[PDB]
Design a protein around this ligand. Structure first.
Ligand SMILES: [Zn+2]
Lengths: 11, 192
């Protein structure tokens, strides 16, 4: 994960 | 900023050494950052680029090592993009003191409820936007990023009971973190 956040996966 | 740049670049190098444990020289960049020798982010980027090239040549353009290097170069460029978006966010995201996501930035990030299909509205910070969509970073565990369509966004001062929410443990922790942030913001409690 990148330091400023990974992409949130759709539901 | 000699020391500030040096500090950020140290985070990046360190992170990319951790990235590299998937499975120009690295000590040279590692040397250069450690001594704070880089005079520009662009210069750092060009070194990472050289290293990538030397690496792909060294091992073969289809080796496991070249795959790793391509991935690392992309991640490094991503870290540099993000560092430009907000230096304070980047610092806090890497140093991670207690309640790191609650400290305000200047200027302050716009705060929104952002809806992703199936999750309901979740509180978030706006990192950037274009007319049709907004790049947000959610409060709560993992602090993940999403591009959210404009019409899936409401300002944070809208009351939560007016919104479709799914009140999980995770959602509640996100909301507690949001309110702590809103307090730090009103207090002018910047990270020191
Ligand atoms: Zn910020």
């Amino acid at each position: 994960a990148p330091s400023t956040g990974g992409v949130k996966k759709p539901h | 900023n000699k020391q500030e740049m040096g500090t950020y670049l140290r985070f990046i190098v360190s992170r990319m050494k951790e990235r590299a444990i998937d499975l120009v020289d690295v000590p040279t960049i590692q040397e250069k950052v450690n001594e704070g020798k880089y005079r520009s982010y662009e210069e750092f980027k060009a070194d990472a680029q050289l290293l990538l090239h030397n690496t792909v040549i060294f091992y073969g353009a289809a080796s496991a090592q070249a795959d790793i290097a391509r991935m690392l170069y992309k991640d490094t460029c991503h870290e540099l993009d993000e560092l430009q978006l907000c230096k304070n966010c980047f610092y806090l995201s890497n140093a991670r003191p207690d309640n790191w996501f609650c400290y305000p930035c200047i200027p302050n990030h716009e705060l929104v409820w952002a809806k992703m299909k199936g999750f309901g509205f979740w509180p978030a910070k706006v990192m950037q936007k274009e007319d049709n969509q907004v790049d947000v970073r959610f409060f709560g565990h993992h602090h993940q990023r999403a591009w959210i369509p404009s019409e899936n966004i409401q300002d944070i001062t809208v009351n939560v009971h007016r919104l479709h929410v799914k009140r999980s443990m995770g959602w509640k922790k996100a909301c507690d973190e949001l309110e702590l942030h809103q307090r730090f913001l009103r207090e002018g409690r910047f990270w020191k």
